[PDB]
C-alpha cells in the first residue's frame, strides 16, 4: 500500500533559561523510529524502532551531525523571527519544521513535503511542484525571495525525490514484519441507562493504521475526538447518546474487507 | 535519513 516518512522538528526558547530546547522525531507512517532532544544527556540520535538499531555507526554519526546542524539553523532562525514579528526578548517562542515524502503501492515517488511554522502559524511551504514556495504573510515573502535566489527548492527536490524515497524503501524492506501490519481492529459497544434515556457508544481499538467513526440517516453537528495510540504500536478511537430504551448501526477500515 | 543538503536559514 501507500507509505510515508516524516521528520518533525521543534525549537523553543525560554524567558531566561539558557539555550533553547530542541526536539526532533522521525516517523515511518505512524511508527516513531528515531528521536533527538537537546535536554537529553546522550546528545545523540536515539533509536525508537526495532529494525532501526541494525544501522551502522557511520549512519548514527551522520544523523547526529545533521540534526545538530538543524538545531543551529533553528537557533539562528529564532533570533531572526523575533525581529520579523517585533517580539520581546523575555518571551518564549516556538519554531516548527516538518518535511517528508509519500510513495505508492509500487513504492515509487508520490509526494514530497516541506513546511515551516513560527508560533504555531504557517510561515512558508514548498509547493507541490517542488519548485516554488508559498509565503504565509508579507514577512515570510522575504524568506521566499532569499530561497529562490538560493535555489533551495532545487536542493530539497533532489533529496525528496531521491534520498528520501530510497531510504524509505530501505526502511520498509527491513521493518517488513512490523511496519506492514493492517491487522483487524476490535469493536464492541457499551450501554448505560441515563431512565427513558440510555447511553450508547461506538468503540474501535487495536488497529495499526491510524486513519479511520453512524446511521439511524447520517447527520453531522452533534456527532463528535481524535485517534489515540496504545503505546505498543496500535491505535484506538470512539464516537452518540439518544433518549431511547429499545434499540441503529455504527460505521470501514483498510485491514477489513462493517456493521454489527 | 535527514537532509544533508538543503537546510538554509530564513
Amino acid at each position: 500500500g501507500s507509505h510515508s516518512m516524516r521528520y518533525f522538528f521543534t525549537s523553543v526558547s525560554r524567558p531566561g533559561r539558557g539555550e533553547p530546547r530542541f526536539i526532533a522525531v522521525g516517523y515511518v507512517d505512524d511508527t516513531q523510529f528515531v528521536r533527538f532532544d537537546s535536554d537529553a544527556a546522550s546528545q545523540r540520535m536515539e533509536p525508537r524502532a526495532p529494525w532501526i538499531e541494525q544501522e551502522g555507526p557511520e549512519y548514527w554519526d551522520g544523523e547526529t551531525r545533521k540534526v545538530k546542524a538543524h538545531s543551529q539553523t533553528h537557533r539562528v532562525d529564532l533570533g531572526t523571527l523575533r525581529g520579523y514579528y517585533n517580539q520581546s526578548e523575555a518571551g518564549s517562542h516556538t519554531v516548527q519544521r516538518m518535511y517528508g515524502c509519500d510513495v505508492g503501492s509500487d513504492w515509487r515517488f508520490l509526494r514530497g513535503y516541506h513546511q515551516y511554522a513560527y508560533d504555531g502559524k504557517d510561515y512558508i511551504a514548498l509547493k507541490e511542484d517542488l519548485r516554488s514556495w508559498t509565503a504565509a504573510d508579507m514577512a515570510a515573502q522575504t524568506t521566499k525571495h532569499k530561497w529562490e535566489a538560493a535555489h533551495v527548492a532545487e536542493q530539497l527536490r533532489a533529496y525528496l525525490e531521491g534520498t528520501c524515497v530510497e531510504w524509505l524503501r530501505r526502511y520498509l524492506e527491513n521493518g517488513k514484519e512490523t511496519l506492514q501490519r493492517t491487522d483487524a481492529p476490535k469493536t464492541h459497544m457499551t450501554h448505560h441507562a441515563v431512565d427513558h434515556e440510555a447511553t450508547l457508544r461506538c468503540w474501535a481499538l487495536s488497529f495499526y493504521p491510524a486513519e479511520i467513526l453512524w446511521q439511524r440517516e447520517d447527520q453531522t453537528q452533534d456527532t463528535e475526538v481524535e485517534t489515540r495510540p496504545a503505546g505498543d504500536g496500535t491505535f484506538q478511537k470512539w464516537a452518540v447518546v439518544v433518549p431511547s430504551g429499545q434499540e441503529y448501526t455504527c460505521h470501514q477500515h483498510e485491514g477489513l474487507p462493517l456493521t454489527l | 535519513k535527514l537532509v544533508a543538503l538543503g537546510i538554509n536559514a530564513v
Epitope: 551531525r65 537557533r75 533570533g79 | 543538503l5 537546510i7 538554509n8
Partner: T-cell receptor, first 113, second 112 residues
Framework: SMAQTVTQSQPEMSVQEAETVTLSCTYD???????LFWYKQPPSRQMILVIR??????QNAENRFSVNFQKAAKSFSLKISDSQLGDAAMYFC?????????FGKGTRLHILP | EADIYQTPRYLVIGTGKKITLECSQT?????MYWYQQDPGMELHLIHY???????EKGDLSSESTVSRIRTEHFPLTLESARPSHTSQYLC??????????FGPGTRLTVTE
C-alpha cells in the same frame, strides 16, 4: 578534528608546459547528497574555485579544465589540458554539505617550461 | 561589487598575548568559516557560524574563540599567543551549500 573523507594520493606532481595532467581524487561518504569542488591556491595563497559539481546535477557540465565525475566509483579527478605556467599551484579536492566543506591534503603542481 | 576582507594580511606578535583577526564580508552570506593552514598547506576548520547567535567548534582547545552578532563580521580571537599558532589563517563566507568565498588571508608568526 579531521574526518577521513577526501583522498588525494599524490601531494606533488609535475607536468611539462602545455600538454595535459590529471589530478586524482577519491572520497568516502555515507551521504547521497553533497557538493564537490576543486580549489586552486597560487603562491599568492588565494583560494580560487575551479569547479562546482552538484552530485544530483546529471554528469559533468570549462576551457582547459575538465572533470571526470564517477558517482558510483566516488572518483572525482581534475584534468588540465595545455598546462600553462600560470597554472602551477596547490590544488584541493573538497567535499561539502550544509554544515561545512572538507578539504583534502591537496596536490602541488609543478609546470616545467 | 561585494567581496570578503580580513586584516591584517601579515602579523608578528609576541607569545602570551591576546589576538584578534577581523573578517569582513559584504555578500550577505549567512554562513562563515575560519581555517588555519599549516606549513604543510593542510586546512583545519577552526570555527564557523550558521548565522547570528550561532558558533560552532572546530578547535577542540579553548585557545580560540569566536562570536557572531553581525552578519558582515566574523572576528577570530586567540586569548594567548603560542608558537604553534604561527600559521596562515583564512576566512570564508558561504551562500548555502555552495562554494565558499575566501579572503586574502592573514599570515601569522608568534615569536618568543
Amino acid at each position: 578534528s579531521m574526518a577521513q573523507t577526501v583522498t588525494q594520493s599524490q601531494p606533488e606532481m609535475s607536468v611539462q608546459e602545455a600538454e595535459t595532467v590529471t589530478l586524482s581524487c577519491t572520497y568516502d561518504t555515507s551521504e547521497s547528497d553533497y557538493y564537490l569542488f576543486w580549489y586552486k591556491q597560487p603562491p599568492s595563497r588565494q583560494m580560487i574555485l575551479v569547479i562546482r559539481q552538484e552530485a544530483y546535477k546529471q554528469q559533468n557540465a570549462e576551457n582547459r579544465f575538465s572533470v571526470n565525475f564517477q558517482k558510483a566509483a566516488k572518483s572525482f579527478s581534475l584534468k588540465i589540458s595545455d598546462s600553462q605556467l600560470g597554472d602551477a599551484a596547490m590544488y584541493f579536492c573538497a567535499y561539502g554539505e550544509d554544515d561545512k566543506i572538507i578539504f583534502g591534503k591537496g596536490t602541488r603542481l609543478h609546470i616545467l617550461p | 561589487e561585494a567581496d570578503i576582507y580580513q586584516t591584517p594580511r601579515y602579523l608578528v606578535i609576541g607569545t602570551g598575548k591576546k589576538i584578534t583577526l577581523e573578517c569582513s564580508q559584504t555578500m550577505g552570506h549567512d554562513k562563515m568559516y575560519w581555517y588555519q593552514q599549516d606549513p604543510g598547506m593542510e586546512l583545519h576548520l577552526i570555527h564557523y557560524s550558521y548565522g547570528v547567535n550561532s558558533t560552532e567548534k572546530g578547535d577542540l582547545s579553548s585557545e580560540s574563540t569566536v562570536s557572531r552578532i553581525r552578519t558582515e563580521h566574523f572576528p577570530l580571537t586567540l586569548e594567548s599567543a603560542r608558537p604553534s599558532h604561527t600559521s596562515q589563517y583564512l576566512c570564508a563566507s558561504r551562500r548555502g551549500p555552495y562554494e565558499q568565498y575566501f579572503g586574502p588571508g592573514t599570515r601569522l608568526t608568534v615569536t618568543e
